[PDB]
Amino acid sequence: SGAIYVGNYRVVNRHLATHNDWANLVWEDSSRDLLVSSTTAQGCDTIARCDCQTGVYYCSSRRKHYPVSFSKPSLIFVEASEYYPARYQSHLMLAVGHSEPGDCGGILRCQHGVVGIVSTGGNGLVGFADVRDLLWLDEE
Ligand SMILES: [Zn+2]
């Protein structure tokens, strides 16, 4: 589990969205495993606006933050999980690392801010849903 709180927005994995997230929906994209809902209180996370390929991510299943190199956001084929069949997921970045289903929502961050959240795992890899292209998260 885990979310990003920026301005009046809450960013979560689409497969973990709650009733309140759907009732206050701003934007969602199944192919990216992302959903954004509106919040009453202002959040304090900053979204990275960069092309970094190194950062640190939180892995709840090991209670550890790991420094990683991660790939550029792309259409990546992902094996079947408990929450999606085998398919291409878009705007996904991979790193070598541990990722179990409950690790979804863990933040990946670089010197500029939040890069994305854990979305996929298995085969010794961890995949992160990028949010750096969602410029509208910074305003309105
Ligand atoms: Zn960066």
| 59 assigned to active site | no
Distance 19 CA to ligand 1 centre (A): 32
Choice among 33, 59, 91, 103 that is catalytic: 33
| 33 assigned to active site | yes
- For 135, the token pair is 């410029």
Between CA 125 and CA 140 the distance in angstroms is 36
Burial 105-122, CB ≥16 within 10 A → b, else e: bbbbbbeebbbbbbbbbe
Deposited resolution, Å: 1.6
Between CA 22 and CA 133 the distance in angstroms is 22
Give, as residue ranges, everything with CB less than 5 Å from ion ligand 1. Answer: 48, 50, 52, 110, 112
Between CA 66 and CA 40 the distance in angstroms is 32
